[PDB]
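#dry-run=false #mode=assembly
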Amino acid sequence: IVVLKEGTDASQGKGQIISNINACVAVQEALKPTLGPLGSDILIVTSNQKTTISNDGATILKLLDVVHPAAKTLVDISRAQDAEVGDGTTSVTILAGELMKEAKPFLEEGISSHLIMKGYRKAVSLAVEKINELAVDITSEKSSGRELLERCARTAMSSKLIHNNADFFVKMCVDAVLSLDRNDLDDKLIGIKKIPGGAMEESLFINGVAFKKTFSYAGFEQQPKKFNNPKILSLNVELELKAEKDNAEVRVEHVEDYQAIVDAEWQLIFEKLRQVEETGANIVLSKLPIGDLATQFFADRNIFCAGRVSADDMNRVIQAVGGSIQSTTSDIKPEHLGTCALFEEMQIGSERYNLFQGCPQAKTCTLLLRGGAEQVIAEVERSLHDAIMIVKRALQNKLIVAGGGATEMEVSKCLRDYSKTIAGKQQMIINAFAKALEVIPRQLCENAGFDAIEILNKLRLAHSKGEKWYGVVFETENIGDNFAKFVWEPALVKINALNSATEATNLILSVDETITNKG
Amino acid sequence: TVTCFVRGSNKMIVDEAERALHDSLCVVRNLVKDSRVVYGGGAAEVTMSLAVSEEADKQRGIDQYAFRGFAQALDTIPMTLAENSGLDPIGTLSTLKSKQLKEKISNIGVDCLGYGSNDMKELFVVDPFIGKKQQILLATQLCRMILKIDNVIISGKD
Amino acid sequence: RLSKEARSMEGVQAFIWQEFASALEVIPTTLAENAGLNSIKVVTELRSKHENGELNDGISVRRSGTTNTYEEHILQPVLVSTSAITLASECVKSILRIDDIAFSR
Amino acid sequence: TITNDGATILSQMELDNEIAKLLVQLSKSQDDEIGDGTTGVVVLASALLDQALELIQKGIHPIKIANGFDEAAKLAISKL
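#status=ok
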């Protein structure tokens, strides 16, 4: 008359471990085409009815949100990679996947999950020692600062729509990172804005913040457009009297006041505009509309206004000009004002836009992308992002390893070499671990359209001869010295990615039961 | 500023004639901005198709397949103009390519307008250069936009 | 040869001749596949090499690639190739002419 | 309503096929930038994809197709 479950689920046994692996591989398969500079883009439709297009593994997996209780481990560890390193999230899942793929036949042959995990833990320690030994401490040796960073961005942009126009965009990326604080380089300080029209090589670098110029209302444009040494004021409130959308009723205690209410509202806006004049601003920003009365008043006071500014831009303006945003106009002090070396209006995109330039207080910059289509501009942004990251990392962290799979193959070699002396079941696991390391140069070749079999075989022979920096060349289908070619990434990327991939591997493999409470 | 005043015996007549001005305004807009023009009627696609086809044989490598394919894709435009006109697209395209090889590369159009003959030089069917340039480049970029998609995941709609 | 000679043809014949020439490639394509070779690579190498050669370039399973057909002794009597062209064309003619089938008893 | 405006037709075509949406985005760019080729850019892009299908089936990698089409476009404009 009694039961144990009443809708309570639990599943235990080796079959559950294999089931966990299969679900986790599915995540790998979603992300495997994103590896490499020629990685493919994935189309995700979100519940908000917006579509996301990206080959960024972090973007894809964060949006995927795999439900399976075990596969979610790959999501967590990828987020750890995204927080601790900032890159390599694609390679962490791929390496974790292949290690679990090899764990499956080991489980079938009767090898316990402990023995599999134990060998992996040893194999990682062996690999990490090699990765450190392979690391190079190099900065401007036989070069200079901009010379390295130029080569770094130029490499990132290879074989992109802006390949021939690299001479223009590479400078933007190098300048963008060098315009930041040299002690803490934060990608969030580099803004990217899309402006349709024009050719890609006509893109512009701005030290301050650009605006979208949202004005179409009759009577605008009749205000000064250029300032040499402006003071900048930002408000959180609107400066308009009668909008093209809104309205109001008139209610009075006396008939004579009927007309007064219309003029009283005029005074209320005027007095707010007057207190701005008392502050001594030259340019006045607002996230909310600024109307005709404000423009006519400000223009006659030699003040420029721009309203309806994106919330993200208003914060960045303050970060550019060194001032402080205020909601009211009565309580404003001159210490709330920023300063620029120039205010100007640009013709970028064959349409006028407002911008600040040469802000002495700036910690940020703005990159303006031009092009004949939004899809192309999106490709430029993605190319700039990767170029910015490699410039940032090359400037920030001098301890590097060769990319392009070169490190994975050198690690693979030393892992196989160790297996020559490792006896017993541990020999089987150290071999499988080394095998997993090869998936990276493999999927790099496959995603690039290369003959992966030929390239992998040549890479194995090259490293066997002591050519420890050779990897996958993506410009010519061959192998070559990725160190000499400046295909770098910080050593910590390979150390943390390999540690993280194994941690997820062992945590998933360690689970012999799933319990789910339903109702 | 000017306002284009459109009249007509019904709503759909005014709406279509008014929108017709939009298209014509775009044409004259582009002609003012960029004086360079090419002849239309599919003649440009045939000339470009022939050039790509002749160059394809010079590749001697794998790319030859894509270069020939690209040219064949261009052919679909003058063939579509034939089919939508009630013309044989095979006889039409054969004539278009033959005239531009046997006589002169000069643009040879199609009979889609019901005129006495082709050879748009005397017929005044002209497209702006920037228009045809963007048409080819943007269509190619879009093809790449789709070809590079190896995985699509679709959720619900809230 | 037919791909180039088709350039002297007009109308449906020009397009069909190009399709005929393409169909011929099924043989060197199949030979490359069964030999374990990359299909496009082998056919592409042969097509380019026939810029200078005529019959000396073909697939050798002994050498596993595109090599000298004469030095490898890869020879076929004219009648065999000639018959394959004729009979294959006659079969296609016969097949395409069939628009119906009726029972007769 | 009755029209032959490809830009209006594609705008009124309401679909959840993400690949088809990419074609609509193409027609939007051409409609704003030039205003002429709103039908041709989609028809041609399809024609290129139709060629890509056969090229893929024959063993040409999608990337090799994309690269070849790009170079072919450069030749097409050079002649134009």
